[PDB]
């Protein structure tokens, strides 16, 4: 019969871990580097581009930082096929919140569900879990700026400051070190581009090699804007911060 | 349009004695105006001493008997041999007739 | 691997052979039947002194005239007591008379072969057969007092007198030269919370042991803690006289 | 670790061994089988081997009648050799119920390789270990032969050949084609194109053919048919008469 | 599609994949509740292999079933907001069809429920996860405190723990509480949660947080501040000596 | 129909639900609560169908208080009658709909104003300063086009009603055995429970 | 490696099926059953073998028709053979019942062919431990044919399958070579019945009991019958008389 | 070898074999003994009851299908079960859509057809249990023996169960006797008794341990325990 | 009978490896070396025609074939799944597309669909990945030309110029020297040729080289005449004698 040939994906160690879990994060530990940090007035999203070529067209290029809602940014570290199948889901919730109730998604809410998508493939069904772990950065008119975290076994986070993918040990006691509670945006920006650029495994921290997004509310409108950093505006804030 | 139902006259009277029950109705089938038979037995022997009968529509009335003789033989299989008492057939012929509360059994019965 | 309803070299079946295992390291039950009733008794077996003792509910009511006690993995037996339960109300309100003894528990057994991962035969979902037997006691009209032994293998056995659990083999050397055919409901009462007292690992008490009882005219009642502690007080009497 | 060679998953190598051994089993009969398009026609040659004295030869048979039109020859086993050709039948008339017209012999043949590559990547399924040659004179293409494998491969030939000793008839045939300088047979009558065929196949095997050695199938414009013992003897004769 | 059987039976009577799930649950942080005479405290250990979270959005460990009754657990994270999600909703269900609450032994014999039928269900394993399942039954001042484990069982305890080092606190526990004088004040049912907690925590003012139920939907979670007065009173008692 | 009826004040919503169940020939009760709290700041009151009428409300209250307890949060009075528009516009198009009207007013504390929709078992939802379901808008309509103003303080709502039901008691042919009347502010939901002679 | 024999629908490295050739041996290990084409139907004849005198003479008959045209005969797993048999039957009555003309026998012949190749195409299913010999008079001519658990099937003048094939085929070949104008039906039964004698050699330890039926368009119609009473009697004394 | 191709049903061992159903088998020697026998008026089943404890019961052996059928087993009782209830259907089918008696050769194409379904398909398992089969029908009596192997055999008489090669040996002696015991069913009962004893060697047959059942002319299938059985004993 | 394979046949190894997508791409490896470039108005796709014998027609044989008449597609690994990879293509781009908004899919979402049909052959029950590279190249109204690259894992990247397959190192190198932002079709094409002459072992030339282009619309493509929107397909498949032609001035 089949049974050969089954993995059994969803089954206990003698130690009582999951295997699949296990080793799925095993494998997103050699994914890009991605780093959120919230802020008093916004958040940012920074992430190390994994392998890149003078070919590679960076302009149309996006396989980090993803746009859920208006509110609702992701980063992403793992399988980025596995990853655009729970960001569609999570964008079909989003909008069917929207639909029912009239108001946008609460980030947690959000969160939660595709946290309880991962654990499903944790628990039954037989398949391998989504080789991926999201950073939500988010607002609503309750938790204000609203940062988390999710794995493969599908269990979620809140943060300050935190990193996955490559060197998230070395990665967060380098925020751990200079985080502050009364911090300001473009102090988080500097934050996140110096962590990386410790971080990294490759020779210097280029542009080409990074993606850039911030969730601000905008003093002049009252309303908050998301922003994924263009090429060129992440050559820009590269040099002003002292990176060239 | 087709009618499922249709109607074979004939009438069915039960007694209850003391120590003794009588369940009688006539031998004749009809339809309309025609007859289909003089003797058509319509009371019968179930088993476990019960005489039953289900007057009305034939097709339904055998085919509730058919059911209830056959609810019997079940009864025994499920139950060591278990003799089936009077009023515990009473009750399972509610459900077989409610069984149908939607396409009703066109027939009155009486055991 | 190999499947979970495979034939064993020898002509039994590997999972119910194993279930039977996991039965071995269970709490103690034993029944006794009478012609003056059944006399269920278990060991609670607390693991712990803060455990409420009395929520241990392992003899529990099926009907008024049919009762059972669990010995084994507990928890599988919820879904069992539930069958029974359904089993013997739904036959109720078909015949409006109740269930045979027998008749329940052979529908309680109808379950135990309910498993695999898809045997061909109608639609058996569950990964595992039952981790529990079951001592289902009761009384009806054509047979009077009945004690049954309900298995995971499907098979029910009536026992006169019947041990299950950990100190099953011993209890039931001791069933066999203690019980007679004319027993009164006392003696059984006395003799079942004798021979739990022996296999116990605890000092039995009124707390970490249950009795319970069947008869024609109460049905089945749980025995109170107090009316229980009266007959061990009663027991120890009767062995400290001789 | 060492089951990817029992299903149709990929090996350390990239490799699906069961396809591999899938194709192993299309040698099984030890028979061989070449194709050839005429100018207006398209002819299979197979061998026929019937080694029980018990069998009935006109029931022994590896070249098929798809459609009206479509012609196909298995090499590899009868039991899977009849699995395809069934299906193909069947997908042949449900064609024509669909779309109004008749199902052009290369159409079949993506078809059937679709068919055969679920097989490549779906675990519960076996290759049929069977290699399918489809013949016909298509309304739009002319003389047509398209070939099928168990890895769900297929592509169209100006002329083939299949078997164990495949090798010498594709080479035989090649030297031809290099010499004749053009992609067909040059010849008006099927009869001199299965002649050609017959020659080929004696030249590259080199064996001598009896009527009851050989088995040939004509695809001409708006029929498909298979020659019988004595069609083949007629040709037998013919090639006789020159040697 | 997939029904594969995890959960089976081993040559010594034992289900694997259960057993290993309680290997999770000791794996968890430390969950501990304790009953007084008229409420029940339900204390639960926080990690610190990071240290850099937002405590306002993180989970709670201590969540509400209904405003009544509370649940705690150990083990896997995951796990148990399923069987949160499943009790919540069957709560709602049956406020709906009885017209009146669950009560704590319902709500719990109904979650031990669904863990067991996780242990013989095809293509599932079991639940990494054990619950503390703590209130009052409706219009009723008796506490209630019960307990579930993956195997599906459960019961009712005066004062239990699960969890890392569950061992060791429910030893405090068992030489702490006595069952004729239960802690008949909120205040010394919340000192002796903390104290149990302080035998495994080691020093942990933001590792330790309590939660105390009342009757008639009386929940209330206590701050890092009323929590660390207590640690601050209970580290005299041993400096005192 | 029943009477269902509701006015938006300066700072609540006020709820007027007749207290009569009408079976065919006779009057079964006079003292039916025809509303149903969803959240601590959300009535719903409710007319129609016979048995659809509970069931539905029942349903509603159910959905609600399991969001409460899921995110320990209080849904907008906005956020909840879309929900319930959407119930009910799935409803109409089923294999037999819920034929159930219904007012809810909510008091919203993020916004700190009352507000009130009204939804028919279409899903047919808007928000009203005064709103009524079946034959009573046709008579009290009029009336609240008159007197009505946003200003007006709960005491003022309530004299309103009490002229919308006098009106009620005059003109329509059905004894509806008086009205249940509700506030709904930033303190909550009370009853006024002296309203058969206020 | 090795374990190419432990799944049905694997290739082996040399293109081999070994759970279908495993299946074969079950056959081998069967009673012998055989078939005999003549000029206007077919015979068909098995060994029935007498385990003990407790067994009801003329009782357990082997021999099963299909619809009322064709015969059917097998050797090895009885239980199988019959399970083919019903699947027959119902593939016959499928046929008649669109096209109103009773099943020609190589359809039917094809019918069971690709039922039984079914069962080698997939690990969850068991091949067939029977080889079965059927046929019947159709539309023009008589047809005989043997399926093997492979699948496989071809028109025979003679078949045989099971303990003594060999003996029964080189009785066959003899058949074959000194009646080129072909066998009749009265002499292909009494031949039936020699072969049969000769066959049980192989397994001359236990005593047999033999079982004929035949189709003949001159002798039953073109409808398949079992040979019974004198016809039966007069087959087996011709067999016992050239036994010695 | 064995172990490498008895994992499952749908496994044939290189040399032909089916363990699985083998092992079935096995289930049936490891059972208690019964017998029966057919004379040309009456069947007849005789089996032996065993008991767990001496406190336990002797679990019951012979099932009733219909007036005119019905078996006795040997091996897992619930399997036993299944198929008897679902003998019982086809007796019943029969009866209600034909208005006929079900042909006892017909019953035994019947349990064959469902036993071979078990030992074909992946995830299913043979059937641990043998059964006899007696019956009364439009052909006069009869006598079947049923193998979870599928297969399905008519005999005059026959034994299942541990040490049944006794009860076997003894028929297939008296055979030319009680093939002729025509019209006297106690003379058959006492045969099948006699034919049982030569299969014991723990006990002696009691009055609660004997079993037997029987069929015939004008003899609804009935079985007899107990008290009935002791002018037997 | 019945798919009994419902679970993953691709599971995540102690190292965090996927075992069957890393053999997938090792398959893709072995394959024939396909490219692609874009230029400042176009793009073009271009791999060898391995005839697998001379006796086949190679014509009846595209490795290159059109999605939609602005989007065309390449591979390298095995032809069987590129090719019923390109069917599932084609119609998902109508399916998911053009039935809903009236027009075909821009390069990028058309490649999204493809990438999640791969990326499920990842994870669904008893399948393995497919066993190629796709070198997707399009246009549409507000992107401009793009070309892609999709992996048997599911990933997709956009390029400026790649190859894939057997010397994909060596002609990616090569590439690396000969772009630059300022490229006419044309010299793209040239660049192509050049390229995959050091990939081609045998003979060179317009029949055993397949190249096509995403260019300016081809109104003489279009078969009707009449919609003044509807100006012609921008695919096109150069002919065999259109390589030759550009093969004399190499």
Not at chain 5, 184 to 190: K, L
Not at chain 8, 60 to 73: N, V, Y
Request: proline share 3%.
């Amino acid at each position: 019969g089949s049974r050969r040939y089954d993995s059994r994906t969803t089954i206990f160690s003698p130690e009582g871990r999951l295997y699949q879990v296990e080793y799925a994060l095993e494998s997103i530990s050699h994914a890009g580097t991605a780093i959120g940090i919230m802020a008093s007035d916004g958040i940012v999203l920074a992430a190390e581009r994994k392998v890149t070529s003078t070919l590679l067209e960076q302009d149309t290029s996006t396989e980090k930082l993803y746009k859920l809602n208006d509110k609702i940014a992701v980063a992403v570290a793992g399988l980025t096929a596995d990853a655009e199948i729970l960001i569609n889901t999570a964008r079909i919730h989003a909008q069917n919140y929207l639909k029912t109730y009239n108001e946008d998604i609460p980030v947690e809410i959000l969160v939660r569900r595709l946290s309880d998508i991962k654990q499903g493939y944790t628990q039954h069904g037989g398949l391998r879990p989504f080789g991926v772990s999201f950073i939500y950065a988010g607002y609503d008119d309750r938790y204000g700026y609203q940062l988390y975290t999710s794995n493969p076994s599908g269990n979620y986070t809140g943060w300050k400051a935190i990193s996955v993918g490559a060197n998230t040990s070395a990665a967060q006691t380098l925020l751990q070190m200079d985080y502050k509670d009364d911090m300001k945006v473009d102090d988080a920006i500097e934050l996140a581009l110096k962590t990386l650029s410790k971080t990294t495994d490759s020779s210097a921290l280029t542009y080409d090699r990074l993606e850039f997004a911030t969730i601000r509310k905008g003093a002049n409108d009252g309303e908050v804007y998301q922003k994924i950093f263009k090429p060129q505006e992440i050559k820009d804030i590269l040099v002003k911060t002292g990176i060239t | 349009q087709f009618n499922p139902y249709g109607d074979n006259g004939g009438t069915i009277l039960g007694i209850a004695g003391e120590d003794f029950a009588v369940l009688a109705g006539d031998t004749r089938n009809i339809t309309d105006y025609s007859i289909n038979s003089r003797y058509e037995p319509k009371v019968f022997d179930c088993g476990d001493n019960i005489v039953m009968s289900a007057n009305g529509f034939a097709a339904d009335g055998d085919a509730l008997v058919k059911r209830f003789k056959n609810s019997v033989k079940w009864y025994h299989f499920d139950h060591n041999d278990k003799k089936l008492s009077i009023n515990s057939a009473a009750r399972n012929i509610q459900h077989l007739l409610y069984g149908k509360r939607f396409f009703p059994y066109y027939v009155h019965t009486i055991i | 691997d190999r499947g979970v309803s495979t034939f064993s070299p020898e002509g039994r079946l590997f999972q119910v052979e194993y279930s039977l295992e996991a039965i071995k390291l269970g709490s103690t039950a034993i029944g006794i039947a009478t012609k003056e009733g059944v006399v269920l008794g278990v060991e609670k077996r607390a693991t712990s002194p803060l455990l409420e003792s009395d929520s241990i509910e392992k003899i529990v009511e099926i009907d008024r005239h049919i009762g059972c006690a669990m010995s084994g993995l507990t928890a599988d037996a919820r879904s069992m007591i539930e069958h029974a339960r359904t089993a013997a109300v739904t036959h109720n309100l078909y015949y409006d008379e109740d269930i045979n003894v027998e008749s329940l528990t052979q529908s309680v057994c109808d379950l135990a072969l309910r498993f695999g991962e898809g045997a061909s035969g109608e639609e058996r979902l569950m990964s595992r057969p039952f981790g529990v037997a079951l001592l289902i006691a009761g009384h009806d009209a054509d047979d009077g007092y009945q004690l049954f032994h309900a298995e995971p293998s499907g098979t029910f056995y009536r026992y006169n007198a019947k041990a299950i659990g950990s100190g099953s083999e011993g209890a039931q050397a001791e069933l066999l030269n203690e019980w007679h055919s004319s027993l009164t409901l006392k003696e059984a009462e006395l003799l079942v919370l004798k021979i739990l007292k022996q296999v116990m690992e605890e000092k039995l008490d009124e707390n970490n042991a249950q009795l319970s009882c069947i008869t024609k005219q109460d049905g089945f009642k749980i025995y109170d803690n107090e009316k229980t502690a009266e007959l061990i007080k009663e027991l120890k009497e009767k062995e400290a006289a001789e | 670790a060492g089951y990817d060679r029992h299903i149709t998953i990929f090996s350390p190598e990239g490799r699906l061994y069961q396809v591999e051994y899938a194709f192993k089993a299309t040698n099984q009969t030890n028979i061989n089988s070449l194709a050839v398009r005429g100018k207006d026609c398209t002819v299979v040659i197979s061998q026929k081997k019937v080694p029980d004295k018990l069998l009935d030869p006109t029931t022994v048979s590896y070249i098929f009648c798809i459609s009206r039109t479509i012609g196909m020859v298995v090499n590899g086993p009868i039991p899977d050799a009849r699995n395809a050709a069934l299906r193909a039948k069947a997908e042949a008339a449900e064609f024509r119920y669909k779309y109004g017209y008749d199902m052009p012999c290369d159409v079949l043949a993506k078809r059937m390789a679709n068919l055969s590559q679920i097989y490549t990547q779906r675990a519960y399924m076996r290759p049929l270990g069977v290699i399918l040659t489809f013949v016909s004179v298509d309304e739009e293409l002319g003389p047509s032969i398209y070939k099928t494998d168990p890895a769900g491969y297929y592509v169209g030939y100006k002329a083939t050949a299949t078997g164990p000793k495949q090798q010498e008839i594709t080479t035989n045939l090649e030297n031809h084609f290099k010499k004749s300088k053009i992609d067909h047979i040059n010849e008006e009558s099927w009869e001199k194109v299965v002649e050609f065929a017959i020659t080929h196949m004696i030249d590259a095997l080199g064996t001598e053919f009896s009527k009851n050695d050989l088995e040939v199938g004509v695809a001409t414009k708006d029929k498909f048919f298979t020659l019988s013992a004595e069609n083949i003897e007629e040709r037998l004769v013919a090639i006789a008469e020159q040697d | 599609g997939y029904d594969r059987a995890l959960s089976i039976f081993s040559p010594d009577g034992h289900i694997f994949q259960v057993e290993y799930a309680l290997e999770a649950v000791k794996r968890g942080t430390c969950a501990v509740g304790v009953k007084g005479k008229n409420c029940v405290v339900l204390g639960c250990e926080r990690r610190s292999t990071l240290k850099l979270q937002d405590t306002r959005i993180t989970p709670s460990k201590v969540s509400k079933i209904d405003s009544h009754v509370v649940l705690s657990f150990s083990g896997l994270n995951a796990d148990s907001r399923i069987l949160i999600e499943k009790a919540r909703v069957e709560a709602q269900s049956h406020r709906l069809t009885l017209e009146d609450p669950v009560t704590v032994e319902y709500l719990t014999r109904y979650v031990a429920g669904v863990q067991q039928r996780y242990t013989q269900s095809g293509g599932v394993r079991p639940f990494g996860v054990s619950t503390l399942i703590a209130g009052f039954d409706p219009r009723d001042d008796e506490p209630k405190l019960y307990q579930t484990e993956p195997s599906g069982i459960y019961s009712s305890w005066s004062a239990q723990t699960i969890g890392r080092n569950s061992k060791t606190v429910r030893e405090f526990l068992e030489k702490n509480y006595d069952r004729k004088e239960p802690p008949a004040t909120v205040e010394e049912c919340v000192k002796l949660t903390v104290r149990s907690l302080l035998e495994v925590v080691q020093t942990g003012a933001k590792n330790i947080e309590i939660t105390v139920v009342k009757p008639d939907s009386d929940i209330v979670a206590l701050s890092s501040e009323e929590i660390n007065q207590y640690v601050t009173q209970i580290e005299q008692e041993k400096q005192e000596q | 129909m029943d009477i269902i009826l509701g006015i938006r004040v300066q700072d609540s919503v006020i709820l007027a639900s007749s207290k009569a169940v009408t079976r065919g020939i006779s009057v079964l009760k006079d003292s039916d609560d025809k509303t149903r709290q969803l959240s601590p700041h959300t009535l719903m009151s409710f007319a129609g169908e016979a048995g659809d009428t509970v069931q539905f409300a029942e349903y509603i209250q159910a959905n609600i208080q399991l969001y409460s307890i899921r995110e320990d949060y209080e849904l907008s009075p906005q956020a909840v009658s879309s929900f319930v528009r959407q119930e009910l516009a799935k409803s109409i198009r089923s294999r037999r709909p819920y034929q159930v009207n219904v007012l809810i007013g909510g008091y919203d504390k993020k916004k700190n104003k009352p507000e009130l929709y009204q939804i028919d078992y279409l899903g047919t939802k808007v928000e009203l300063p005064y709103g009524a379901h079946g034959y009573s808008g046709f008579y009290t309509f009029s009336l609240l086009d008159h007197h009505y103003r946003p200003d007006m303080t709960t005491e003022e709502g309530l004299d309103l009603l009490k002229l919308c039901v006098q009106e009620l008691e005059k003109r329509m042919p059905m004894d509806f055995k008086g009205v249940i009347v509700k506030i709904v502010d930033k303190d909550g939901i009370r009853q006024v429970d002296d309203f058969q002679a206020q | 490696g090795t374990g190419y024999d432990l799944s049905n629908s694997v290739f082996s490295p040399d293109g081999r099926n070994f759970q279908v050739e495993y299946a074969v041996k079950a056959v081998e290990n069967g009673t012998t059953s055989i078939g005999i084409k003549c000029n206007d139907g077919v015979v068909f004849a098995v060994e029935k073998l007498i385990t003990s005198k407790l067994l009801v003479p003329q009782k357990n008959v082997k021999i099963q028709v299909v619809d009322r045209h064709i015969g059917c005969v097998y050797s090895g797993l009885i239980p199988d053979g019959r399970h083919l048999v019903n699947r027959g039957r119902e593939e016959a009555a499928s046929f008649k019942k669109l096209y109103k003309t009773p099943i020609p026998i190589p359809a039917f012949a094809d019918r069971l062919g690709q039922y039984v190749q079914a069962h080698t195409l997939y690990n969850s299913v068991r091949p067939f431990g029977v080889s079965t010999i059927f046929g019947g008079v159709d539309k023009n001519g008589a047809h005989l044919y043997m399926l093997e658990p492979s699948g496989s099937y071809w028109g025979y003048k003679g078949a045989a399958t099971g303990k003594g094939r060999q003996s029964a085929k080189a009785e066959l070949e003899k058949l074959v070579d000194h009646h080129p104008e072909g066998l009749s039906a009265r002499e292909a039964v009494k031949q039936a019945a020699k072969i049969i004698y000769l066959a049980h050699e192989d397994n001359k330890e236990k005593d047999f009991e033999l079982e004929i039926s035949w189709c003949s368009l001159s002798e039953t119609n073109g409808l398949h019958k079992f040979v019974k009473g004198d016809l039966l009697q007069e087959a087996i004394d011709f067999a016992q008389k050239e036994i010695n | 070898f064995r172990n490498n191709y008895d994992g499952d049903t749908v496994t044939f061992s290189p040399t032909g074999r089916l363990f699985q159903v083998e092992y079935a088998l096995e289930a049936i020697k490891q059972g208690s003994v019964t017998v029966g026998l057919r004379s040309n008026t009456h069947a007849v089943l005789v089996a032996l009851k065993r008991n767990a404890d001496e406190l336990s019961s002797y679990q019951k052996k012979i099932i009733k299908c219909d007036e005119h059928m019905g078996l006795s087993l040997a091996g897992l009782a619930p399997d036993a079960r299944v198929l008897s209830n679902y003998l019982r259907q086809q007796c019943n089918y029969s009866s209600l859509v034909f208005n006929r008696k079900l042909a006892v050769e017909r019953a035994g194409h019947l349990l064959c057809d469902k036993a071979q379904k078990n030992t074909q398909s992946y995830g299913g398992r043979p059937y641990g249990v043998g059964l006899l089969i007696i019956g009364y029908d439009k052909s006069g009596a009869h006598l079947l023996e049923f193998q979870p192997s599928g297969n399905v055999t008519e005999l005059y008489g026959t034994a299942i169960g541990a040490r049944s090669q006794g009860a076997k040996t003894y028929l297939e002696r008296t055979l030319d006797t009680f093939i002729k015991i025509d019209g006297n069913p106690d003379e058959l009962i006492k045969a099948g008794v006699e034919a049982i004893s030569q299969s014991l060697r723990d006990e002696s047959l009691t009055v609660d341990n004997l079993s037997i059942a029987i069929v015939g002319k004008d003899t609804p299938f009935t079985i007899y325990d107990g008290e009935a059985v002791a002018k037997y004993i | 009978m019945t798919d009994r394979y419902s679970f993953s046949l691709t599971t995540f190894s102690p190292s965090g490896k996927l075992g069957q997508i890393d053999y997938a791409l090792t398959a893709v490896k072995q394959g024939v070396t396909s490219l692609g470039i874009k230029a400042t108005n176009g793009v073009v796709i271009a791999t060898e025609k391995k005839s697998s014998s001379p006796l086949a027609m190679s014509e009846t044989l595209s490795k290159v074939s059109l999605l939609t008449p602005d989007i065309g597609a390449v591979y390298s690994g095995m032809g069987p799944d590129y090719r019923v990879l390109v069917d599932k293509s084609r119609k998902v781009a109508h399916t998911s597309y053009k039935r809903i908004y009236g027009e075909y899919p821009p390069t990028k979402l058309l490649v999204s669909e493809v990438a999640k049909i791969m990326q499920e052959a990842t994870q669904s029950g008893g399948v393995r990945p497919f066993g190629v590279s796709l070198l997707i190249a399009g246009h549409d109204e507000f992107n401009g030309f793009s070309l892609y690259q999709v992996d048997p894992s599911g990933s997709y990247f956009p390029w400026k110029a790649t190859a894939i397959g057997k010397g994909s190192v060596a002609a990616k190198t090569f590439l690396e020297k000969r772009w630059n932002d300022e490229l006419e079709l044309e010299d793209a094409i040239h660049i192509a040729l050049l390229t995959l002459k050091e990939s081609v072992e045998g003979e060179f030339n317009g029949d055993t080289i397949e190249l096509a282009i995403i260019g300016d619309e081809n109104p003489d493509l279009l078969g009707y005449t009449g919609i003044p929107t509807d100006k012609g397909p921008r695919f096109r498949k150069l002919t065999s004698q259109e390589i030759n032609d550009r093969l004399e001035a190499l």
